[PDB]
């Protein structure tokens, strides 16, 4: 089997992407944030504290003839940005772009943090990291991909995120029309539960390539590109007036600037992030100070190839017995 679904930016900055997901019978369609940096599929629901729902579409398990309470199971997750959610668990039928999994764990939120409430466009998350990170207790549950894998034509999914435009998540096949040149594959460590890999270096603008190993994760659920302070300083030094602002929480730059591109290495191959992808707009409405899309990972504890990086590429998440990651230009 295969599946193919369009993923759409939630706002004009590409802060996140939503993908429609069918849950239950009859289908309840919710727009979920596909997150290769976590492993829980959780939704706003009829069980979510009412004051914490503000415009989201909810899953109502009592209206699904295929929903079953997973007795005794609870979940609770905290994300790198400080947001969180928790609740109980149902199993139900879940379909993405024509690909159906029966008996998928659907984690129903009883509580969500303010960041989730305040984002009306995201109805939940669909985790695509390794199932070892799944938070369901006392019986850990599998991701949608893990459940689908054996049925797929090939044990892969691909992320093709757009810049200020829709893109595509495919399951079970590689669309050879969706990228240019070849896909370069690179090793993955699953030891921390992530799609963790090592970039071979970087360049800033038209500058020379610096060969250096940068361990990090391919994370569709993180907006920005978080890299070591040395790398980030080298980038922003090429932007007149750019500075790190403790009050704002990262590098800012004059909105009048033209940003240079940023290149990262995948083996001997190179992915070029255009300068415009690095612009996250005014720090507050009407400001002429703009927020940068490349930020320091210092004190995160890990480098994160988030959407800023991934959307410059066609990305293969290869879930073969030994997982790998592939990157192509597009």
UniProtKB/Swiss-Prot annotation:
Catalytic reaction equation(s): Hydrolysis of proteins with specificity similar to that of pepsin A, prefers hydrophobic residues at P1 and P1', but does not cleave 14-Ala-|-Leu-15 in the B chain of insulin or Z-Glu-Tyr. Clots milk
Residue ranges annotated for the Peptidase A1 domain, each copy included: 17-328
Active site: 35, 199
GO biological process, one term: proteolysis
GO terms of molecular function: aspartic-type endopeptidase activity
Keyword Hydrolase: yes
Protease in keyword set: yes
Record keywords: Aspartyl protease, Disulfide bond, Hydrolase, Protease, Signal, Zymogen
Annotated family: Belongs to the peptidase A1 family.
Name of the molecule in the record: Endothiapepsin
Part of the whole protein covered: 90 to 419 of 419
